[PDB]
Design an enzyme around this catalytic site. Structure first.
Site, PDB file in Angstrom:
ATOM      1  N   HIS A  64       0.550  -1.025   0.040  1.00 33.10           N
ATOM      2  CA  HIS A  64       0.294   0.047  -0.059  1.00 33.10           C
ATOM      3  C   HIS A  64       0.891   1.777  -0.292  1.00 33.10           C
ATOM      4  O   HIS A  64       0.555   2.185  -0.440  1.00 33.10           O
ATOM      5  CB  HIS A  64      -0.995   0.127   1.173  1.00 33.10           C
ATOM      6  CG  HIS A  64      -1.817  -1.168   1.313  1.00 33.10           C
ATOM      7  ND1 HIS A  64      -2.990  -1.030   0.749  1.00 33.10           N
ATOM      8  CD2 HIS A  64      -1.736  -2.064   2.268  1.00 33.10           C
ATOM      9  CE1 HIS A  64      -3.395  -2.617   0.599  1.00 33.10           C
ATOM     10  NE2 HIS A  64      -3.131  -2.704   1.723  1.00 33.10           N
ATOM     11  N   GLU A 102      -2.527  13.794   0.497  1.00 29.87           N
ATOM     12  CA  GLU A 102      -3.696  12.859   1.092  1.00 29.87           C
ATOM     13  C   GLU A 102      -4.502  14.489   1.341  1.00 29.87           C
ATOM     14  O   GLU A 102      -5.555  14.846   1.161  1.00 29.87           O
ATOM     15  CB  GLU A 102      -3.732  12.204   2.297  1.00 29.87           C
ATOM     16  CG  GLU A 102      -3.069  11.066   1.786  1.00 29.87           C
ATOM     17  CD  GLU A 102      -3.747   9.890   2.057  1.00 29.87           C
ATOM     18  OE1 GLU A 102      -2.789  10.031   3.535  1.00 29.87           O
ATOM     19  OE2 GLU A 102      -4.325   9.318   2.250  1.00 29.87           O
ATOM     20  N   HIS A 115       4.266  11.237   6.051  1.00 28.70           N
ATOM     21  CA  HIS A 115       3.059  10.761   7.350  1.00 28.70           C
ATOM     22  C   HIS A 115       4.577   9.852   8.430  1.00 28.70           C
ATOM     23  O   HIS A 115       5.026   9.332   8.158  1.00 28.70           O
ATOM     24  CB  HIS A 115       1.921   9.628   7.017  1.00 28.70           C
ATOM     25  CG  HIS A 115       1.087  10.185   6.156  1.00 28.70           C
ATOM     26  ND1 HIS A 115       0.326   9.930   5.758  1.00 28.70           N
ATOM     27  CD2 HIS A 115       1.017  11.306   6.135  1.00 28.70           C
ATOM     28  CE1 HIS A 115      -0.913  10.596   5.020  1.00 28.70           C
ATOM     29  NE2 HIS A 115      -0.924  12.063   5.099  1.00 28.70           N
ATOM     30  N   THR A 196      -5.521   7.392   7.458  1.00 27.76           N
ATOM     31  CA  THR A 196      -6.273   7.391   6.237  1.00 27.76           C
ATOM     32  C   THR A 196      -5.754   6.699   5.412  1.00 27.76           C
ATOM     33  O   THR A 196      -6.367   6.370   4.307  1.00 27.76           O
ATOM     34  CB  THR A 196      -5.447   8.558   5.565  1.00 27.76           C
ATOM     35  OG1 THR A 196      -4.193   7.696   5.756  1.00 27.76           O
ATOM     36  CG2 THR A 196      -5.334  10.461   6.470  1.00 27.76           C
TER      37      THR A 196
HETATM   38  N1  LIG Z   1      -1.698   7.276   6.650  1.00 28.06           N
HETATM   39  S1  LIG Z   1      -1.929   6.679   8.265  1.00 28.06           S
HETATM   40  O1  LIG Z   1      -0.566   8.125   8.591  1.00 28.06           O
HETATM   41  O2  LIG Z   1      -2.941   7.532   9.217  1.00 28.06           O
HETATM   42  C1  LIG Z   1      -1.623   5.167   8.281  1.00 28.06           C
HETATM   43  C2  LIG Z   1      -0.975   5.209   9.439  1.00 28.06           C
HETATM   44  C3  LIG Z   1      -0.328   3.195   9.950  1.00 28.06           C
HETATM   45  C4  LIG Z   1      -0.509   2.396  10.721  1.00 28.06           C
HETATM   46  C5  LIG Z   1       0.765   2.042  11.480  1.00 28.06           C
HETATM   47  C6  LIG Z   1       1.471   2.375  12.739  1.00 28.06           C
HETATM   48  C7  LIG Z   1       0.764   2.333  14.127  1.00 28.06           C
HETATM   49  C8  LIG Z   1      -0.747   2.669  13.777  1.00 28.06           C
HETATM   50  C9  LIG Z   1      -0.759   2.992  12.242  1.00 28.06           C
HETATM   51  C10 LIG Z   1      -0.553   2.964   9.253  1.00 28.06           C
HETATM   52  C11 LIG Z   1      -0.790   3.409   7.449  1.00 28.06           C
HETATM   53  C12 LIG Z   1      -0.813   1.792   6.122  1.00 28.06           C
HETATM   54  C13 LIG Z   1      -0.375   2.622   5.531  1.00 28.06           C
HETATM   55  C14 LIG Z   1       0.255   1.375   4.305  1.00 28.06           C
HETATM   56  C15 LIG Z   1      -0.546   0.100   4.714  1.00 28.06           C
HETATM   57  C16 LIG Z   1      -1.149   0.394   5.287  1.00 28.06           C
HETATM   58  C17 LIG Z   1      -1.937   0.851   6.377  1.00 28.06           C
HETATM   59  C18 LIG Z   1      -1.850   5.244   7.419  1.00 28.06           C
HETATM   60 ZN   LIG Z   2      -0.141   7.861   5.227  1.00 27.18          ZN
END
Ligand SMILES: NS(=O)(=O)c1cc(-c2ccccc2)cc(-c2ccccc2)c1
Ligand SMILES: [Zn+2]
Ligand SMILES: NS(=O)(=O)c1cc(-c2ccccc2)cc(-c2ccccc2)c1
Ligand SMILES: [Zn+2]
Lengths: 261, 260
Positions: A64, A102, A115, A196
């Site tokens: 992703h 975003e 991020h 997000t």
């Molecule tokens: N886009 S984000 O900033 O809101 C974001 C945060 C976390 C996240 C990670 C660890 C603990 C807690 C939250 C994971 C992703 C993510 C991006 C690609 C695929 C899956 C998840 C994205």
């Molecule tokens: Zn993100």
């Protein structure tokens, strides 16, 4: 399973991930009607951001985004609690539409967004646990535009060749993560929002810096063209492009700014 | 049912209305990286739009918009089929953020948007039948911005105070609908998309006129503050505001323009 395109794309996330259909969703459009200056928004300090070049950190294509694992000894100071880093990752568009941040400002996207995800380490043992709790997470967002070559960003981008496909990982050396932050980090937008991506938990304190960083067109093209969303042996390979969620309704929220204009 | 706010809002539509998560969704942002001039896009003619002052037409608060019923002798000329009118309705934001058009132009919302919905009368008996079928629908979209008081729009707006609650209806004397359109109707964007409300069927030929119309800020404020989504007797009333869908991704596809 979820994607940014086609049948399992963002309008269908709420089917399996109900928070994606809930309140306080991110990202949003930052525009004048919903901004309000808040002089109580003082500067953050970034502690432990200069990671040792002699230590290694895991860079991963999770299908992703491309994500770099960060140690819990990197902290933000200035929020109510101390938050510690867990990972950073990026969002971008595509070579023919290089506008895939975003958050938007006055309806305009930037080229990409970084991020840097943190969790309340005063209260919780890890980010997985924190992610479920009220104000459990704090994310710093850096808006990226085309400009001069940025040596600090290349400490990520020069490694993308190793994580071309979903599930590929490579250890990379530490570098100063503070170098990825823009000038004048005292200037920022702050609001209550969400992850997000699924599970879209409404547990994020957002800080979006006002001023973008610059990377070169060659750097941006590398980011936009190096990665696939699919396994190396997937029979339907998909380039990793346009990996950003559309902006969400305000739901009565205001965005608070540490600056007036 | 469905709403624009809370757990039944737009990110949840696909759970009960699966086309909301499918292909060809509207509305979209109209920008240059996806536009394309096409010479086949000639001026639409608006036939039977001068409604007879001797007829009256039903205005209804359906709980999601205010809509005026239109007669099937009203129609668009110029498309491969004839499209006959069924209704018009509007979308708007709220007093605190008065930018609630559905389509955007270079990232920008207008104050509001008017949609005049037609059905393919050559292929189908009625709007109902047409809505989920091949080439069933054509919608005209007019972007609305603030400016001079607009008497044409007042023919509708003057009735807002009488349809405040869901399921309430009022009658509107016939008038010329073409007065709700901008000047220079010759310039417009064109693309295949969807209904912007459930069931989100991908059966709409959109025409969005290049040029906006103007209404006064008193008129806009009336639109934003007059109506409720709920029945009169409701313990917890909900204002009818922000009744627009967010813009959808539009990848590797093309909006065609009648101008350059
Ligand atoms: N886009 S984000 O900033 O809101 C974001 C945060 C976390 C996240 C990670 C660890 C603990 C807690 C939250 C994971 C992703 C993510 C991006 C690609 C695929 C899956 C998840 C994205
Ligand atoms: Zn993100
Ligand atoms: N916004 S739209 O143009 O794509 C649209 C078209 C039609 C429509 C109406 C008749 C036949 C066929 C299509 C109905 C609505 C609608 C608005 C509020 C509540 C329910 C439905 C909205
Ligand atoms: Zn509509």
């Amino acid at each position: 399973k979820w994607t940014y395109f086609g049948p399992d794309g963002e309008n269908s996330w709420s089917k399996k991930y109900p928070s994606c259909g809930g309140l306080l969703q991110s990202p949003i459009d930052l525009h004048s009607d919903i901004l309000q200056y808040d002089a109580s928004l003082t500067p953050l300090e970034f502690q432990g951001y200069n990671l040792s070049a002699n230590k290694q950190f895991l860079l991963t294509n999770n299908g992703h985004s491309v994500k770099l694992n960060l140690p819990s000894d990197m902290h933000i100071q200035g929020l109510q609690s101390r938050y510690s880093a867990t990972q950073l990752h990026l969002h971008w568009g595509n070579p023919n539409d290089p506008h895939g941040s975003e958050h938007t400002v006055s309806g305009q996207h930037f080229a990409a967004e970084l991020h840097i995800v943190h969790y309340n380490s005063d209260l919780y043992p890890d980010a997985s646990t924190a992610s479920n709790k009220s104000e459990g997470l704090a994310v710093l967002a850096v808006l990226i535009e085309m400009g001069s070559f940025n040596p600090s960003y290349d400490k990520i981008f020069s490694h993308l060749q190793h994580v071309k496909y979903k599930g590929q990982e490579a250890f990379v050396p530490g570098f100063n993560i503070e170098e990825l932050l823009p000038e004048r980090t005292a200037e920022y937008y702050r609001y209550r929002g969400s992850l997000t991506t699924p599970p879209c938990n409404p547990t994020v304190l957002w800080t979006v810096f006002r001023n973008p960083v610059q990377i070169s067109q060659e750097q941006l093209l590398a980011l936009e063209t190096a990665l696939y969303c699919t396994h190396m042996d997937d029979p339907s390979p998909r380039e990793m492009i346009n990996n950003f969620r559309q902006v969400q309704k305000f739901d009565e929220r205001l965005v608070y700014t540490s600056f007036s204009q």
